[PDB]
Amino acid sequence: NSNICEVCNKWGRLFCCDTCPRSFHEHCHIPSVEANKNPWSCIFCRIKTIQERCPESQSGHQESEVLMRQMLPEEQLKCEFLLLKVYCDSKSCFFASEPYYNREGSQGPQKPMWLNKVKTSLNEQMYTRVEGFVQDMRLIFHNHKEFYREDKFTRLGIQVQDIFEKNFRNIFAIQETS
Ligand SMILES: [Zn+2]
Ligand SMILES: [Zn+2]
Ligand SMILES: [Zn+2]
Predict the structure, then answer these.
(1) CATH code for the domain of 124
(2) Which of 96-120 are b and which e, b meaning 16 or more Cβ less than 10 Å from the residue's Cβ?
(3) In terms of domains, do 71 and 54 share one?
(4) Is 55 helix (H, G, I), strand (E, B) or coil?
(5) 135 CA to middle of ligand 1, Å?
(6) What is the per-residue DSSP string for 107-161?
(7) Residues with C-beta atoms within 5 A of ion ligand 3
(8) How far apart are CA 44 and CA 141, in angstroms?
(9) Are 55 and 65 in the same domain?
(10) Relative to the alpha carbon of 19, which ligand is closest?
(11) Range of the domain at 152
């Protein structure tokens, strides 16, 4: 197995996947690495199994259909994986914890949002449809763009939203378009 966390790229107290060479900090994996379970398979491996069991699941889908899906176990897992893919980028640090807003010429957002809040909401089964998770994720970046205005720091929101959207299209097999 790897000797660094797949998510944050640091060593430490690492749990190793039994079916692939990846490794994880306990709270870097989503869901948090399970207490017992021998063998243990990571979220990457669990996602690959869903695909392998239903090869047709990779055919193109419309985003509007995907958003309306109820959060049954497979969709829960897909949203956990998509969240984890965002944490895998180091620029997610800016969006992880609760923000505050005190900048001359700007007013904070009406509905603040951050990655650790989405993580808690998934763990608590607070989303009933994919749409609830996707709307909170996109709100993170939209709040950032609106608040930072013409500051070049706005670009961080565009960057991490692009990681989110590429992974969304991949994980939920969104129909490719020009
Ligand atoms: Zn880690
Ligand atoms: Zn694995
Ligand atoms: Zn099938």
Answers:
(1) 1.20.920.10
(2) beebeeeeeeeeebeeebbbeebbe
(3) no
(4) helix
(5) 26
(6) ---SS---HHHHHHHHHTT--SBHHHHHHHHHHHHHHHHHHHTTSTTHHHHHHHH
(7) 54
(8) 25
(9) no
(10) 2
(11) 60-178
